[model samples]
Target: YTDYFFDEPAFDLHDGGYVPLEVSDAPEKPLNVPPLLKPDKETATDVYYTVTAEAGETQLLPGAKTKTWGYNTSLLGQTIVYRRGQHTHVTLKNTLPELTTFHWHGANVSGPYVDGGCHAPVYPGESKHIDFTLEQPATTLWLHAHPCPSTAEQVWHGLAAMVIVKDDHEASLPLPRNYGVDDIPVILQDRRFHENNQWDYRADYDPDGVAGPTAMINGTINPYFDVTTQKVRLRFLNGANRREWRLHFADDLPFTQIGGDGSLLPEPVKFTHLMLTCAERAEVIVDFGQYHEGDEVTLYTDDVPLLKFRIHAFKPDQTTLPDKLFDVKAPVVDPALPVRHVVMQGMDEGVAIDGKKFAMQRIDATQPIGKAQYWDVTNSNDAPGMVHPFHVHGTQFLVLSRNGHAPYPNEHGFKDTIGVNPGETVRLLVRFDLPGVYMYHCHIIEHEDGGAAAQIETFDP
Candidate 1:
């Protein structure tokens, strides 16, 4: 379908404090592609690396540098790659003044501790070690701070990074594999520049979600990419706190979406316009065969241009996409178990799950590990309310329906996050392979922090 698969009326555009994106006046600069993080030690089966959360200065504007927090670099951290089935060891170090936890957005691991939620905290000047093996399909994921009430604020301080999972099946496909060239990560974010080119998170805090007026793509404003190949793959992550990007190319250029949040779609789907909710990821390939050298194409969000593609001469790429990608084998739900109900009610600071605020020490629900069940996640808002992006930790789920209807076209595969329109009830077939306590909540960081969140314990029973 050519339409963006989202409820139009519930978009962030209709919100009271909606920040309309504007064409950045800053000088056009090359898009910043974060470098691959080098592992400290690597063997055939095990890999080790250290990720440090530190504070530094980044030259975001013309004059003064912005004081920011990152995993390693000054701004957004380096891209970390993980091969499927490889045991990974990571040293989570905190050099910043405050404590933080490194939450893997889509990682399928044991929760609460290894999942890197608020339960696990690394204090200032302290380091913690954790190890886990990837047992899921190859896709685009991310790592960011998850310190309860400070998640949105820390992310605003620049504490997020792209993560790629690799596997033999995905590598065998006929697709763009060259990193930083035909394939690149597009981390979509926005920010409001304060005096002296700094970001004041407290001043712009909103109970619903905080947003900025300027469009920041991969930490660069007014960015342009040199399109030197016939086809380029963009792994888009809506890293913004609240802004939902309604993206389309110049003159409605078509693109094929191959992957979603947790895994590649069962088959490729083409579209002209795509909208991404907060923390959702979409991997799409755009073929620029219609343009010639010196021709330029602009990618816009709403009416504001976000990135420019300066087309360059390139050899013809006749590669065709495969008819079938990954095979989705959904687990059968247990017939004895009744449908689980989770209600997302209220707005702004009033956000809550099942009418109660989030308590880290309390487990709101319990389920048997490996037993599939239908979960009815409902948004109890009236019309003209915001769309809440619901997210589950530690496992990927399949969307069964939306208010008794089929989900969006691209939602056929595994997903860790899904957007629920106001007054909508999204049914999901959820199963956890491992036993642990996991947090499930609205992904709008502020909402998750305030109270629009809950936790579930998956026990071996």
Candidate 2:
């Protein structure tokens, strides 16, 4: 029983007791980094991509074949890059036996329908075409299957991948931009493997969120990274269904945070410990100047080793980052505009928003297409409970305050997902660029499927 990770301020328990759990330690496996999967095809100004959801077998462990589902592959889908001002045309096909829908979790698009929420469904052996121009800022986003009640189940089978947005603002920055080298995308996920190294969701399903004993990073088990440079940038996404990752380095090294969900931070802040809930994205850089060629740095959670890093000999890089990275100016809120109240409640059958379950046909809230408004989202749970990562669609929001206090240092930029601790009320400044219905719910997929989600319509007023 380790209390190392239990001291997180996000999961502070007010009433319910603590649930002691053990995480599997990373094995002494050699540092065999997996290749960065890129889009199969691309073009200038207009990019074309195809995603086919299919079933196949993979060697998840050393020997046995495990049944899994993925996008255009036998496992997790490949990384896709979207350039700013380019029209992204995609062909989404479902070859799987069951129904599925392709949902861009952080992409700003027409919702409920084109956004691929519960309303958009591609039956077995069907395909759909969609196109949208990328207007949002550059950051780390993702693509996954969001099929309402079965969304969590499908994602557990591995229907997820990284979707990176590119723009001039990010391209011009004097940072590590090379793919698979100084810059890397880290997808943090966990799963429980049963017989034949296949996952049995029912065996380890938790109403709160389903998590496994293993810490799988970018589909690599017992993973390690060979730090071949003096400075490396890590773009991380909390792809787990329910677990909150309390991250800290083995040597108490500080992380320089640069970006958040869908947007870059105005300035970087240094911190030693960082916590992220489901679907949250954080981009950080770690410098290895203090270590020698033979030294090894371990990334761990609560003192348990997760990813091992070997510092190799490299040329000294004294490149310093500019103080201002991006401009994040929120539109002034109108005093005449009334505040909207959004409540996140429950852990059992009561898990929901606005005291109601998710209804596909019902629009829980509505707002104008281009008006900035204030939303007071509260976690109505009694206290001493889980933190719900609140996410909005079709637009990224600015977190104003948490329980009447200033936002975190890294949260000064735009964000699509914000964590609301138990018994805490959060203030969010919101505005939608597109018009349509979008789902807003706790990013914990399990709770989301269990009626914790609600839909909002953004239309021209």
Candidate 3:
């Protein structure tokens, strides 16, 4: 169990640092979990999405508005759903008197400017446009600001949203597909609230990335959701800047994982506990039919209650989940193709790839687009280092093998970001359908901003 990447992080959150409360000290006030906010659409076939990042205030606690940044509303952007093969056009608008780019995390798109990586910077009071076809299968993608060095700080201020991609295959399956009622978006994050009830990012700021003392789901604190159905599909997005979420239920109830970062898996894998790294996503269905009404089931990380579920009365239902969820066929990498090596090292400013800081104008690697290649991504960290979630733009990759063995059953699908352990190398099957310069780095915004990133040049053959 310890050999793979599913092991918990080794760093101590209480190690010679200031923590507001211990994990056992739960918050007193409880509130209903906010429903998933979907973005305004222009059409069903041809979709148009616009997001603005501006300064605002939110009543995160009892009184007063905590100054924050969001897509359009007070906190966190609306969920935008785009169908597969739909030609979607997006307009990225920045209203804050600063520079930021709306990066589509877990989205398969062109890069440099289109992908919204660090290279694509949208200035203050400006709007940029880009269009792409949703070629991949249906899954949960997310959007956030990706400005260099400021990415972590801006994201901490709350500029993230859910981007749900739907397709015909998944739509044909007999599963819970309701938008907000049954298909829920659970964004797991942490924040440290000051006495003023505002997020004090500076006070808890760490070079390795600051972790809040409290948990946040869809930007709601001490939140609970009403389970109105027998089964609910939960889209879990690790929106935290640093911390890895190790989750489990109150009575050790099992949930089936139907999808990974990009698309659904070939078969659903059941588990009692799961961990999600920063920016990674997992779609799971929890069956409440096993439990009766007037019962309260809570989800927790260690002893800290993350969110509670209030079961309600529902009609008896008997529906079966599909076994073959997705058409999972790994790409055949030419045996003659040589493997590429990429290493992630250090912590904070000490972080680097291949032992050097990322230069804005440098091309670390070059490859031909549309060819499947093996990438050996190694975490070259010393003892006590945390997990680094490796991410690549343009194309979703299949986890080939971890340390030369088959990947965990749940990780057999297409993924954009994966957690690599210290001194462990993850073998990924990489292929870019679109030719451009794509950035590959640690999805952790702080490490990414601190130059723990690199770029790859993909050209037409």
Candidate 4:
């Protein structure tokens, strides 16, 4: 077993603890979008980037100070926007004193280097340039550290950010694109702050990396934004390493979900409570035409108000959502190939794949490069009601079947992360087209960091 600096048992604030778990209201800051420009008329695009997991301070509240680690910024890095079908030139520079790497959470690109797997970590003062083409559709994606045992700790320090992929296809859709006005990105995360303005995850790492008594919305503590438009589009991302958010409007407003991690769904689904796990994305539109000026609407989870919108009068637009959004083709399953069963079990040091802990240089599994495979991921924890979110890297998969029944309404579309409850087996149709090493782990950061993570190699050539 690996030695750690702290040995305190992970505690949940809900179970009656002195942990700092409170909600406070603050105003929304203007959205920060990085200026992305392609060089010359060359078909290949090149850009230089950097990654640093260092200590810094940001005022979450007006006067309260909080410590964090960001890439070229205070908390989370600036939003990196790129259009689909465009080649990207990214030079990753590691400014942190420790070792870390960048994992493109949901982008499907070609090969070992472009995939940014565990083998591609960049050390301190090291710079690595990566060139690849963005083949995925227009959607909200993100980048974060993926070092085997340290993924959770580094991410907990705030080393992640939004990467938006745009395309003409999505631009034609009648959606809100008013940037900070109507189109907004909400990165939902939680953390526990210690005295001296320092944050500690050592006390909360449970082989699964679950830390937080304080819920931060968009890096701010209990923030609110003003709504000046009748209809607004909110891009929600569950950046939490472990906690699952059951989101709902405090006033019970019916919101429509227009997209998921992959992109826009075939049809919008209206719901009151939306569940999100780590790295999951949901695009929804809220129509506040019924409210008058000065009316207040709040978004809440378990009655805890997260964000509030004070209504303001504005002219209505003629835009209407189309019946069909994007075409999501489900993968075909080939039964002739041998079936594989992956058991997702344990937390902390007990976390393992098929009962074996993660060994950095070990090849856990191997498969033919271009073949489609079905993986029966089973979570056998004794907590019958407990559920864990399972996520895969490098490719998106279809939830073919869940416990021998149809998936939930919201899970009808393509997904990169799926919630698998204890005693249930989730079958997914996955295909790794590019030759590279990829990670499959529980979305629970503590569990992943503890040992419930593994890697797979795809050799198509």
- Residue-level lDDT for 253 in candidate 2: 87
TM per model? 0.99, 0.94, 0.94, 0.89
Q: 325-426, model 1: which lDDT tens digit per residue?
A: 899999999999999999999998799999899988898999999899999999999987988999999899999999899899899999999999999999
Model 1 stretches with alpha carbons more than 4 Å out: none
Candidate achieving higher lDDT, 1 or 3: 1
TM-score of 4: 0.89
Clash total of candidate 3: 0
Pitting candidate 1 against candidate 2, the one with the higher lDDT is: 1
Q: What is the per-residue lDDT of model 3 for residues 127-160, given as tens digits with 9 covering 90 to 100?
A: 8989998788999999898887688888899988
Which residue ranges in model 2 land beyond 4 Å of their true spot? 1-41
lDDT of 2 at 90: 87
Q: What's the lDDT for candidate 1?
A: 0.92
lDDT value, residue 441 of candidate 3? 88
RMSD in Å for model 3: 2.4
> Can you write out model 4's per-residue Cα lDDT over 1-461, one digit (the tens) per residue?
21111111221223232234357444555333332333323443443344444557887655557777777677877677777766777767777777887888888875446767667778888888777777767888888887666888888888887778887888998889877788888888888766665678886655434647778776776666888888999889898876656678866787889888877777888877787766789989998888889998888755566778888887887467887787777656666778789997764467667888777777789877667889999877654234667888888777778888877666666678877776778888888767877778887776776767778888964
lDDT per residue for candidate 2 within 1-461, as digits (tens), equals 32322224446222242332345443455433334445446667787888788999866577587788888677777778888899888888899999998888888889877788788899998899999997889998888888888988999988988888999989999888877888887788888877778888888777777877787777777777888888988888899887777787886987788999979999988878888888999999988888899898888765556678888887888688899999987898767689999999988567989889998888898888788999999998764567888998778899899889888778889898988877888899998888889888988888888899888888886
Best by lDDT: 1
lDDT of 2 at 451: 93
